[PDB]
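INFO  loader      accepted 1 record
INFO  loader      residues=710
INFO  predictor   begin
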Amino acid sequence: IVETLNFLSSTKIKERNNALDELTTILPTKALSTTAVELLASEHTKYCDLLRLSLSENRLSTISYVLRLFVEKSCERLLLAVVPELMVKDGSKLVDKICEYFQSQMKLSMVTNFISILLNLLALDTVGIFQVTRTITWTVIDFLRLSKNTRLIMSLINQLILKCHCFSVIDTLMLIKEAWSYNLTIGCTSNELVQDQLSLFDVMSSELMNHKLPYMIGQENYVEYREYILLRLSNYKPQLFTVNHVEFSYIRGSRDKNSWFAWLKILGITKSLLTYFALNRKNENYSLLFKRRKCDSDIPSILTFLIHLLEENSSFAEQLKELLFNGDMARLFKVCLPSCLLLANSIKSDEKTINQIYDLYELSNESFMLWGYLQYISSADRIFEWLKSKWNQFCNFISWLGNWDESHKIWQHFQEQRELDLTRYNEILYRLLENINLCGDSTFSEFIAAYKRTTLITIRTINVDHLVLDKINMKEIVNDFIRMQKNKSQTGSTIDKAVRAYLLKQAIGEKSSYNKILEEFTEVLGEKLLCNHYSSSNQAMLLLTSYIEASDCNDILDWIISRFEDNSFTGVAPTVNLSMLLLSLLQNHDLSHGSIRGGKQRVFATFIKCLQKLDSSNIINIMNSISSYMAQVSYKNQSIIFYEIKSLFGPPQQSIEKSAFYSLAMSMLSLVSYPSLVFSLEDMMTYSGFNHTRAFIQQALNKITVAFRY
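INFO  predictor   done
INFO  writer      dumping tokens
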């Protein structure tokens, strides 16, 4: 049977792309379904169904995020996308869908890893269906189920670490978008956080750092028609230990980190295992505790900066944040314990204290910091020689500056490092700079190894991969334009050289390169998933902007690039950003009416925007020329845009920001009159208060424009 042959082709999943081509060629309704890794699975499932019409559509939409194992839809990666979401909901049994979904998702049926993941997805949005979403979130947060992985909870923490309501209404949306961008640092930031967290003491971080932040927010919240549900939740939170108990158990890891991190006698004290005592205290309190959570022996000048930092927190932590979004005795103990630098930073027998530092240097940036504080001297001379031996993170010689034996030591270090050996030499040279007559000798020795018109390693993949790319990192020190070169190679001081290669001749040379790139991009139609590369419109606009910035000929070139962007008919994020960029060029203007069209496109390309609205306002405020024409038109255009009202108060906040963009010429008063007409509780007033603050004495303190308001 031809059907059997088709089945064999599908079964033969090796070189699946060939099988896919065969299926495409094959493209009897039951067989049509049967003809369909994942592709092989599609063939098998459809064939079973064929062997056995709404059901086919239902099967196609079945088990999407709720996959059999995997269906490439855990977080769902046009009209079809909106329809699919609706179908999925129907099977489970576009803002409107988002609201239905926020509520339906919390409703579930039952009500655990799935919850942390859904929450993470919702938090990333920095939006969702306002209050409907917030009510859904409260219920979902409460339904902890089989609570403790931590990283998913931490992703959810992007929102849960800000467990509050109505504190920044018609404001928080812009802040949330900015937070999402910061949250996006995760991946590389997570790896860095894990390394730093473990290096400083014994903390894990590893993208779970924000889960701890969410727990802190939860404690703070506990101590504090959708609205009725939210009010009830606010009270329930006092003791609604929705995975709080899980956190209490998970916290054993935090206790371990704190112990690792650990006036020495007071520091040595466990403060009666205060971290555990605090948890016990909270458990005993049962509800709305926090406050004095067993903070026994909470720092003392038992003989400071750390205490101030601890209060602020009530640095490896910075890495975690990026992912989230008798002197001799003291010196010997501080070095032997290796936070030697912290002890030294707070504190500053000197010869012996320096000898301990000297040994620490030999052991080889905390060491430099410790020395710098200590150095705030024969003692230093001894350490300098040891430091030279140590030379042959970092900072090193920086300590001497941060604070002629030191110079003699520098000469010894330079010669020893100068003698990849180049990496050692590179590090020594950086130290020489870090500290910025034997010092001249040190420079000469480092220079002698460097030689100049020389290299010490020890076009595609010949540009650096064949040779040099390893060296680029292997003997790296300090900083160079070479970093840009490496980034350019990865994207695929060479980056500077490439610009130099083009060096209006540069524009023409660059234009030729751009033309080649443009042709490839044009060839690459719908280059994304099983959808389209919407960003291409934005890329075309970016190219246009550079050419226009140039010069009339470049602007002519810009028009062609812009014309491609102008097609729009693409996801709004790309089409609208492209229109906005075009409008920014229009704002600068030139010697053509074309600027008017670009501005119209940006105006047409409406979005809630939030943080982007603010950015747009900041740009809008920079232009509208003057007279009583461009200024007037801009005001009219803004006035005619968002109605706010509804439950769209953020638009009113945006209007207020616009109202603040000049006054008593600018019709800030008209904007104010509109705000007065719209009795948006005191939300409008709060926004006005912010504008008033910008003006110093304003509003009741100096209405001023009251003369016209009257």
